[PDB]
Design an enzyme around this catalytic site. Structure first.
Site, PDB file in Angstrom:
ATOM      1  N   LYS B  12      45.398  38.357  59.656  1.00 23.10           N
ATOM      2  CA  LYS B  12      45.668  39.786  59.593  1.00 23.10           C
ATOM      3  C   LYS B  12      46.165  40.117  58.198  1.00 23.10           C
ATOM      4  CE  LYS B  12      45.866  42.127  63.003  1.00 23.10           C
ATOM      5  NZ  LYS B  12      44.699  42.640  63.777  1.00 23.10           N
ATOM      6  N   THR B  57      44.092  37.568  65.239  1.00 28.55           N
ATOM      7  CA  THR B  57      44.753  38.157  64.088  1.00 28.55           C
ATOM      8  C   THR B  57      45.841  39.073  64.649  1.00 28.55           C
ATOM      9  OG1 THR B  57      43.287  40.117  63.872  1.00 28.55           O
ATOM     10  CG2 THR B  57      42.562  38.073  62.799  1.00 28.55           C
ATOM     11  N   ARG B 170      50.578  50.067  15.047  1.00 31.46           N
ATOM     12  CA  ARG B 170      49.847  50.650  16.163  1.00 31.46           C
ATOM     13  C   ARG B 170      50.723  50.575  17.402  1.00 31.46           C
ATOM     14  NH1 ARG B 170      45.487  46.085  18.535  1.00 31.46           N
ATOM     15  NH2 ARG B 170      47.083  44.507  19.029  1.00 31.46           N
ATOM     16  N   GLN B 213      47.621  38.494  22.249  1.00 28.44           N
ATOM     17  CA  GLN B 213      47.625  37.083  22.649  1.00 28.44           C
ATOM     18  C   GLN B 213      48.950  36.406  22.279  1.00 28.44           C
ATOM     19  OE1 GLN B 213      45.092  38.752  21.331  1.00 28.44           O
ATOM     20  NE2 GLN B 213      43.085  37.830  21.719  1.00 28.44           N
ATOM     21  N   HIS B 241      44.583  51.299  25.262  1.00 30.17           N
ATOM     22  CA  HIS B 241      44.475  51.996  23.992  1.00 30.17           C
ATOM     23  C   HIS B 241      45.026  53.402  23.888  1.00 30.17           C
ATOM     24  CE1 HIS B 241      40.902  49.063  23.912  1.00 30.17           C
ATOM     25  NE2 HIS B 241      41.872  48.519  23.200  1.00 30.17           N
TER      26      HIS B 241
HETATM   27  N1  LIG Z   1      41.644  38.208  66.103  1.00 29.18           N
HETATM   28  C1  LIG Z   1      41.712  39.525  66.476  1.00 29.18           C
HETATM   29  O1  LIG Z   1      42.780  40.067  66.841  1.00 29.18           O
HETATM   30  N2  LIG Z   1      40.538  40.201  66.430  1.00 29.18           N
HETATM   31  C2  LIG Z   1      39.676  40.167  65.257  1.00 29.18           C
HETATM   32  N3  LIG Z   1      38.304  39.833  65.602  1.00 29.18           N
HETATM   33  C3  LIG Z   1      37.803  38.559  65.353  1.00 29.18           C
HETATM   34  N4  LIG Z   1      38.543  37.557  64.801  1.00 29.18           N
HETATM   35  O2  LIG Z   1      36.613  38.412  65.675  1.00 29.18           O
HETATM   36  C4  LIG Z   1      40.119  40.625  63.844  1.00 29.18           C
HETATM   37  O3  LIG Z   1      39.728  39.926  62.887  1.00 29.18           O
HETATM   38  O4  LIG Z   1      41.010  41.487  63.797  1.00 29.18           O
HETATM   39  N1  LIG Z   2      43.180  41.406  20.485  1.00 28.26           N
HETATM   40  C1  LIG Z   2      44.247  42.219  20.253  1.00 28.26           C
HETATM   41  O1  LIG Z   2      45.413  41.795  20.197  1.00 28.26           O
HETATM   42  N2  LIG Z   2      44.130  43.596  20.068  1.00 28.26           N
HETATM   43  C2  LIG Z   2      43.064  44.350  20.729  1.00 28.26           C
HETATM   44  N3  LIG Z   2      42.143  44.939  19.765  1.00 28.26           N
HETATM   45  C3  LIG Z   2      40.827  44.633  19.773  1.00 28.26           C
HETATM   46  N4  LIG Z   2      40.538  43.297  19.872  1.00 28.26           N
HETATM   47  O2  LIG Z   2      39.940  45.509  19.694  1.00 28.26           O
HETATM   48  C4  LIG Z   2      42.793  44.323  22.265  1.00 28.26           C
HETATM   49  O3  LIG Z   2      41.996  45.168  22.700  1.00 28.26           O
HETATM   50  O4  LIG Z   2      43.536  43.599  22.954  1.00 28.26           O
END
Ligand SMILES: NC(=O)NC(NC(N)=O)C(=O)[O-]
Ligand SMILES: NC(=O)NC(NC(N)=O)C(=O)[O-]
Ligand SMILES: NC(=O)NC(NC(N)=O)C(=O)[O-]
Ligand SMILES: NC(=O)NC(NC(N)=O)C(=O)[O-]
Lengths: 287, 287, 287, 287
Positions: B12, B57, B170, B213, B241
């Protein structure tokens, strides 16, 4: 004590591209959401802020648009071009991950240059390159389906926390999210996508469901058995609960007609269906 | 070829729980979004729709609420109780994945039972059990930060598609998404989360950034160097950006004051900072 | 048979602007989402496509950024300048609607130029100009609050469709969305906003609620009685249901401790609280 | 000084209903998101917390599901039954607002009880009752459309803040959001909705756009001229900018083929097209 830079990647995410083909009056539209990320030797960039090896994310974005000018047959073909470009263009770049979401459009009354969005599903493609090897994973998402009958759920074990009542007739609704890995790049990408989509829909609708797990297994099996170029398919299916409303408090019965569609929580069934003998855990799934 | 059932799990998802502690007039609030999924022998459930091994579930959902009644010190400890329960309670259940998002609340003017949501960040926890091994990954998300100066980006290669200009001033804005794996379950979960959050914020703010990075590496290093119980931390940082608007066409300068905050595309920088010699690819990261 | 152009307006929506104040080392951040729409004689633009009176939305966008360069005391002061500019700068433009969302930032450990987003609430402002008349509506949204006790709901009528049990102790949770109209533009906008926010929170927390309608009435009364420059305040409060989970099936009890926070459906209580004698239906509420 | 309760309304919002018609093997599906709010004498509820007149929102929700059991021909007819029930069933309830979103489903390969969601548009309906007066507004939203050519924009005024270049060939993309008011309840609701949808799409596609305002005017004109039961139609159309990428720095031309689809900001053009002489400002638009 000692810190080490592990796996890492970087690039430009969600570059929205629209390519219009208009060599003739019959315009064509290709709508993508593209993401590009590189892998390789970016040690100094992280430990010293030395950007000598850092191909700007802005540059990666410019490349996507520059390449789009030449056109592309399929989304996968476009990603393959990008991946080859970055890996071969820079010695310190040894691989990467290039992904795209493809959005569909339909002509408005077969008009030559007027369209409307088909939002009923989104196609995906992911290319990963590592050294001399590459792998492609295609997928579909956002495809909501529902069976008003032909679904059961009984025979489950009972413990002190069990209150669920067994049933032989319930609604089965889910969002189809599937991804499959090709064992070769020589594939008719558009044809296989259309085929897989149809196979998933067919297995969903025609399988008398005794469990969501069973339905999912049949959907996966149909794909592997039909396409030799596919080694495995992974699916994540939520069980979107449609509760049969109790109307007796109002003096009425409810013969499986009135339902409350709950948002959360929801069952979530996931599985990997594989071709016997294929790779157990390909790196492309790590993401 | 034959079709084989590979990795699989079910349960679930997104069980919304609010636990109120009201022993005294001074009420306390714990707000969680819990997901429970089991792993084990579910072969028959998939191939034949045999639900003998399928703990409903719905039952998993009931167990979450039943366990909440006894109260829990931290989110991680709550998940540990759930995980041990299912794995130890059913022979065919060999492990699973339990996760939760924790939402923060502040008292309104120090009121005993009136609160307001602090939406500036969301805390996460994921527990995966495999046999007797218990692995926990805590994290933070949705925490947006920005430096109005103290960020530069130059020295990058200028290829045939590069148009980005070098700069020594920047804005650097990002959404902090970080996840760290503990090498032991005996942790003061709340104290470490608070410390980690502070270390990330501190490194982001005080590091004169020559690259996103580098800022990310410093954030990760501070965490590993400070907490012996952490083996690795992974971060996914978008470079949101804020373009310095060109007002020259209107006869004005713009001394790093007026910006356009773009939605997409955005740079996406990601990396894993590890303690030397620690596990390379813990399965918990696969999900 | 005969068609007529009715009410109409156009402009640029959601212009994301970040204005950094850096005359000193102590930087300040103003983050806005601005929308500009003009009203006037645009008859020919609609019936003939004659753009002589159509000030490009791109131009409206550029103006926002150009004006931001001069800085602004408050968001309302900024919208006032924009509206004055457009209505007076063009003869055929007789009015319009300028609105903005203001996002809040906090310093990271009191740092001079490093901040983190305070996502717990969003401030709004809307200015409408009609000829020589103008009106301003300020507001707050996205502020989630909850009382774990001190809320009752009984005495309601019971028809054949009523099943809800009366209670003298339940959780009361909502999202505070409020907007108030000023009866004059000469206001200390920032001080009033902080005051109103505090009065709303106080009334919500300290009022022993017999109904969400009463709580809302008390919240609005506090505002009107405290600020002479405010003629009316409108609130839209959802009753975000937190259901006391039935734990009896598990051999437990639930003394108002364990709750299920449902997404939908939800109660929606809305009302206008005004100063006796004030205008009944100001045009600014039409949007 | 003296505070007074002004306009007010309350009820249950977003009741998700799925009605399955299965008298025959050919199942039919009706999927709605319903909201019910009442208006009348609720003075005591607000000023004293006296709930004698407060029909519980939970009761309003129960009524929606009980009424669904009998089935309904259209969404509008369903809302009409609800409105009459509450206004006629409670002396102090003199009116209200009942609304709904209708979601579309398509059969999977014409299957008798298996469907997939058509997410390309959402149909809406709102009923407002005020004493003896009734008014219905139907609408469509989420319908994204695009013309790759057949759109121009030139002849607009140029001030010091204008940098936009005139064009005779650009992409025109928008999300169709339209709402029309009926002048009678004697309407084939489903047939008119299908017709209006087709008229809007047809006008958008076949009109050589010299301005979005003109395109919208033609869309509205077509609807009013075609349906005598409609007195006015309102539209809110964003101009979702697709910027022609400049590839000249790379020595490439771009003959209207490669575009960047920006998220924000966006133009927002809105207008009301009315049958000559009809009501200028019907109350239903206020909400
Ligand atoms: N297990 C359930 O309570 N019924 C469900 N139905 C299944 N497992 O076929 C679902 O995924 O909610
Ligand atoms: N690589 C960067 O630190 N600056 C950036 N600038 C670039 N690569 O166009 C980005 O988008 O993360
Ligand atoms: N009207 C109330 O104060 N309480 C609520 N409870 C009902 N009406 O079922 C609600 O949803 O707002
Ligand atoms: N007014 C238009 O037709 N086109 C647009 N272009 C402008 N006005 O810059 C827009 O954004 O709606």
């Amino acid at each position: 004590t000692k810190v080490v830079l592990g796996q890492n990647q970087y690039g430009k995410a969600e570059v929205r591209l629209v390519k219009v083909t208009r060599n003739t009056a019959r315009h064509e539209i290709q709508d993508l959401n593209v993401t590009s990320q590189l892998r390789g030797d970016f040690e100094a960039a992280h430990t010293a802020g030395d950007n000598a090896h850092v191909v700007a994310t802005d540059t990666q974005k410019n490349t996507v648009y520059a390449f789009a000018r030449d056109g592309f047959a399929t989304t996968e073909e476009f990603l393959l071009r990008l991946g080859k470009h970055f890996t071969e263009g820079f010695d310190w770049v040894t691989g990467g991950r290039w992904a795209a979401q493809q959005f569909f459009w339909d002509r408005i009354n077969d008009h030559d240059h007027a369209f409307s969005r088909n939002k009923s599903e989104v196609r995906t493609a992911v290319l990963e390159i590592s050294g001399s090897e590459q792998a492609i994973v295609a997928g579909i998402e956002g495809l909501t389906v529902l069976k008003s009958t032909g679904s059961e759920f009984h025979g489950f074990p009972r413990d002190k926390y069990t209150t669920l009542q067994e049933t032989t007739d319930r609604i089965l609704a889910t969002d189809v999210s599937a991804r499959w890995r090709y064992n070769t790049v020589e594939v008719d990408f558009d044809a296989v996508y259309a085929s897989v989509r149809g196979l998933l829909l067919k297995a969903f609708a025609e399988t008398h469901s005794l469990a969501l797990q069973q339905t999912m297994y049949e959907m996966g099996r149909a794909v592997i058995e039909t396409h030799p170029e596919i080694d495995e398919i992974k699916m994540s299916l939520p069980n979107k609960h449609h509760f049969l409303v109790d109307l007796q408090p109002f003096g009425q019965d409810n013969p499986n007609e009135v339902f409350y569609a709950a948002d959360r929580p929801y069952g979530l069934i996931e599985a990997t269906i594989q071709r016997e003998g294929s790779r157990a855990d390909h790196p492309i799934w790590s993401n």
